[PDB]
Amino acid sequence: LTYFSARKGKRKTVKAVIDRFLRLHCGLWVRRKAGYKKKLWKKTPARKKRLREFVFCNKTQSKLLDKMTTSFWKRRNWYVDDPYQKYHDRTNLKV
Amino acid sequence: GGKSSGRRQGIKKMEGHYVHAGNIIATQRHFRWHPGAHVGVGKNKCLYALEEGIVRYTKEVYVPHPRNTEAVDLITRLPKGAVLYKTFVHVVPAKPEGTFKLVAML
Amino acid sequence: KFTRSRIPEKVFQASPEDHEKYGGDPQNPHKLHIVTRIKSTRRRPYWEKDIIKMLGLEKAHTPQVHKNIPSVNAKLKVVKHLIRIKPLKLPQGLPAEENMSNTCLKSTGELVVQWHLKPVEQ
Amino acid sequence: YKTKPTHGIGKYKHLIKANLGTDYEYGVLNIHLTAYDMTLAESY
Amino acid sequence: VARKERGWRTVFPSREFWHRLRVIRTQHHVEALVEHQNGKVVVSASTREWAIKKHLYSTRNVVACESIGRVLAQRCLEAGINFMVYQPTPWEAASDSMKRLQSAMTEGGVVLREPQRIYE
Amino acid sequence: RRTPPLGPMPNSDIDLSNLERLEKYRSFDRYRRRAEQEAQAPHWWRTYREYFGEKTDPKEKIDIGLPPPKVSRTQQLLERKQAIQELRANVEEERAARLRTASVPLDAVRAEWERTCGPYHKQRLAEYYGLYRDLFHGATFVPRVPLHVAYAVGEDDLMPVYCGNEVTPTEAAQAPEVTYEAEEGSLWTLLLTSLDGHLLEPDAEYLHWLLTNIPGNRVAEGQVTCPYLPPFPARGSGIHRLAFLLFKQDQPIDFSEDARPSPCYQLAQRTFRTFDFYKKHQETMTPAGLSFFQCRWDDSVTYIFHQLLDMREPVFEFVRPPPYHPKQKRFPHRQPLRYLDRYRDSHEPTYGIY
Amino acid sequence: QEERERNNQNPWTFERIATANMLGIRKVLSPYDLTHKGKYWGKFYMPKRV
Amino acid sequence: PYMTREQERGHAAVRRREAFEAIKAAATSKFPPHRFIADQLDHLNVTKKWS
RNA sequence: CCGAGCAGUACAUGCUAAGACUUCACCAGUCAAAGCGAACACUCAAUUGAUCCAAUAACUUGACCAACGGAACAAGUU
RNA sequence: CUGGUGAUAGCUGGUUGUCCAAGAUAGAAUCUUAGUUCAACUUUAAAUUUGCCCACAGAACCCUCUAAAUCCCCUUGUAAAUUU
């Protein structure tokens, strides 16, 4: 990670995180399952069913990806007809 | 080899524990505990709760299914008067299925 | 392997010779204990260290009163080798509101309610 | 469970089975039924 | 909407029912029982009673088994029982006496399969 | 560590010495019959009956019925054996039974059934519906006197009520026809109650018919203490049960305290408790017959609440408890995307301050 | 040996202390010592122990 | 023992429950202390002198 | 000290969805009520391999990556 | 020799005033075992309500049998515990 750029003097963003993970504005990170396109002929339908699911990340992994991206990806977006628009906020969450 | 680690299989919910539907009660390599009332069995002989309630372990008479050849062939050679026993795990439901409530006055 | 010790129930069954030896009475058991720690919790298992903290027996040679009930006695059966157990004696009865400032516990287990600090005239 | 009084309730192996002729009982006997008719030999 | 006792997959017979048809045939008599899952018997029909015995030449033949079902089905309708499960053994199911008993129950208006529980 | 058993072991009686000379089950049916016998006996260890079996009191239920009839067994057996011999004497009955073409008359069997063991089956059947549990708080009685009640539907058909059979309120809009065998000079008292029909007090019951001091079988001559009222089970409230109680009186009884105006369309006066009613009349009155049926809701129930009862018909619905979901966590690790939908109230988008 | 155990004048024995865990003595003892009662140490047997 | 297991049971449930409620009261009363305006103005006395 | 790097039977070995287990992390792995749609969560202790990339209209496929959490490709000798 | 050069070094050595407080020994992966990441443990702040000790009851048959115990766990003693 480049903490200070050599031309602008500001933190840079790792493009490996952006191409793999989706960040919800609430603070959660959504990822894919490693191996959902590999050797599907030997995997049971129940196993394949949970491979093609979008899953969240835990406390440590989410904080890791936050330090690897800049504030441009932590902003609130208002895309028209966004499939994940309803997932940017938490409801009935206590503590 | 022999570098294999333990599978962490055993009793997950003890006697008197409050469980919900779908909760796994016990994981086992073989049928150490047999499924009782409101208890299902998966592919890997995994016992899961079918109802929300309290888990109980009892000793019940084991009656094999007629199709099961190995278990039926075992009871045909038993001395007359002998009865096989095995440990069964039951879930006693705590809440009723539903209640009738007034919705309108027509 | 060193583990916890299960004391057989036969140990805590007083014989008739013991009642005339310590002065107890099985028909009228005492109500309260006087537990005093006389041994260090150092070099002892951690579970025995906790029970001493539960009973408020941190400082040694400091009397503490507890109730003669099976649950309290259950904890005492685990650290019985670190404490001295003595029944509480009440020659004048339970302390009253006017006797709270005049009580005194003697080494014999008697809790006197009139501590005058004066020689007996008898 | 072993510490429970109901230990060994599920035991069944001791109920399942795992020649010399003594002076009081015959060891092995073969009963031969020879006849020209097969029906009578099988029936007897 | 009443829950059935699911489970008992490793033993026989099952317990996932509200009512069960249990047929007991001894050396001399044949008896059929309709009992709830809790063990309570709702209605019964046996050849030991004089009412059925007085018309039966033999209480241990196929005719006796068939005649029990016709009387039992009549009593089930009066009692209000229309659905019950039957859990026979492979040899009992292939027997001619049980096939006619089941025929009498079906012709008597009783269904040998309970409707599925409504979960939602 | 080991602990001695608290009682005899299951297979302790089996002798392990002569294992070869012990008879085997040799079949599944033989083991199954023996296995069930041991399952019905109490054991010192935990059993399925302990937690799921219906708890019962050690005190046996008291009997408040009529004394059992007195029959000479020796005379009965001689005639019964003789009849079977004549039935077996016929060569046509044997051939018909051997050819599996014989059949018995259903009407004749029930005629003898109702006289010998009909009352006994009815007591067991009534116990299943909890009629003894609710009406008499567990007290039981054998219905020595058969009761035949049938509702008039039209002019040619009748709806018999034997025990708990389904009957619609439309068929029960009018008082049924009550027929029962009785001697002259005896006094009877009919009673019809709705156990589950009450809308306010679960314990209380609704009175639908009360006829007292009925002379013999002439039901019409009986005093009309409370006019007949058709059952009115609310819609969506399930299935109700109404029980016909047939009492036998030894001496004339005064029902001034239980008298109700004609007609009685007030549910507060229709409130009735069988336990308290029989409690103060048990001295000279004893139940003799029993009949009951199950009733659902139909369109005729709407007419009862609006016109007869002059009230709005209540509607009930079977409501299930909400599904269980664990406490929501800030980071639902490895949970699918649909995790957040389980804890969301509305399905419509929100915008906050925007 | 049985006579020696019966007439022994010492009120304190190995078996009594070991089973009752007096003075926390099981911390320096062995699980087998609850049954050996001090008569067996290692592979050696002491007949003089009661 | 003075009392048996059955007699002892439930004889201290009220006091035990009330003692823990006092723990909750102190635990959930944690808040920053009040900030007074007199304290801020008292620092002007560091330059107080004689006329 | 003995094995595994498969094979056989299915062709709903379809689609979805409560609640749980989890090889002490992660990754990965496992069980599963109900519902929809059909009929009247396959056997098997292990029987396996991530990302990038490449191929493909698409569905999908690709390593004795066996040093088996794998560097795209590098041995001796002083 | 000068410059890149303040090369790099999982290695060696060093790392400056006062006082108080809490504080030690499960593991997994790694061209990895002189390192590092994660977990465990430890620290601080915050929210919350149970935590620990533990009465019965309860946890398997086998290859025939067999130990100290452990899990679970109302009371009770106590004041910790979980979450962020």
Ligand SMILES: [K+]
């Ligand atoms: K490697």
Ligand SMILES: [Mg+2]
């Ligand atoms: Mg884990």
Ligand SMILES: [Mg+2]
């Ligand atoms: Mg490796």
Ligand SMILES: [Mg+2]
């Ligand atoms: Mg690994």
Ligand SMILES: [Mg+2]
């Ligand atoms: Mg350097």
Ligand SMILES: [Mg+2]
């Ligand atoms: Mg310190």
Ligand SMILES: [Mg+2]
């Ligand atoms: Mg490597």
Ligand SMILES: [Mg+2]
């Ligand atoms: Mg507790």
